[PDB]
């Protein structure tokens with residue numbers, strides 16, 4: 683999940 | 695059910711999705727079709743129809759490019775646009791009610807599978823039979839010129855063009871596409887999902903919002919919804935080509951080096 687996870691977590 | 699509060703709520707969902715879509719995706723279909731058919735008063739896209747015009751338009755507005763051959767330089771740009779796309783789709787997905795409250799790994803999985811089908815879907819907005827709009831409508835690359843590119847690059851887009859031609863015939867607008875796109879992301883049958891039932895629950899709600907949207911927005915096309923559900927399977931089938939063509943960077947294309955994010959979306963799929 684690494685990079686997609688990171689995108690999914692970033693409030694934005 | 696006809697005109698009940700539940701149907702009013704399905705419209706509210708539709709409008710919410712459409713607003714999130716406006717916000718997630720800078721160039722919309724309405725804006726893309728205006729350029730494609732030469733309706734705008736103010737637009738002027740740069741046309742790339744051959745190698746020379748490519749030399750000219752390449753720098754629309756550094757050491758990313760290096761001294762690489764044209765077909766590779768082009769697909770380096772294709773890789774970036776598609777990373778922008780994945781990021782916008784991810785943001786859009788997060789605006790779908792219920793999405794952020796799903797298990798995070800299921801979110802991942804849904805995006806991992808959904809993102810390619812959504813790229814195909816949204817790319818059609820940017821395509822006619824002649825070429826595709828790029829760099830938010832600032833450029834147009836002809837189908838013919840992309841075919842002229844050396845193997846395997848010269849036939850990447852061609853399948854995307856064929857899908858677009860048939861999907862565009864359905865004449866969906868951006869408000870129809872917002873719901874359709876959401877339906878695709880909340881697919882309860884992706885491999886590896888942990889909790890399938892809460893995903894199917896959001897989708898069923900979305901499918902109903904979709905059905906109502908198409909009756910209200912496309913009153914003369916009684917089978918539209920049935921046709922859309924069919925394009926959903928089509929999409930699953932077309933995207934495997936795409937997935938495989940990006941594994942060509944295993945080798946050959948020893949000078950490709952795939953973007954880290956695209957690598958993640960491709961492997962174990």
Ligand SMILES: CN(CCOc1ccc(C[C@@H]2SC(=O)NC2=O)cc1)c1ccccn1
Pocket residue numbers: 768769770771772773775776813817828829835854940956
């Ligand atoms: C020709 N173009 C866009 C081509 O149109 C696309 C076709 C396929 C994709 C999917 C991506 S490409 C990849 O590597 N993996 C993906 O998911 C994304 C875009 C260019 C070229 C240069 C600059 C901007 N635009």
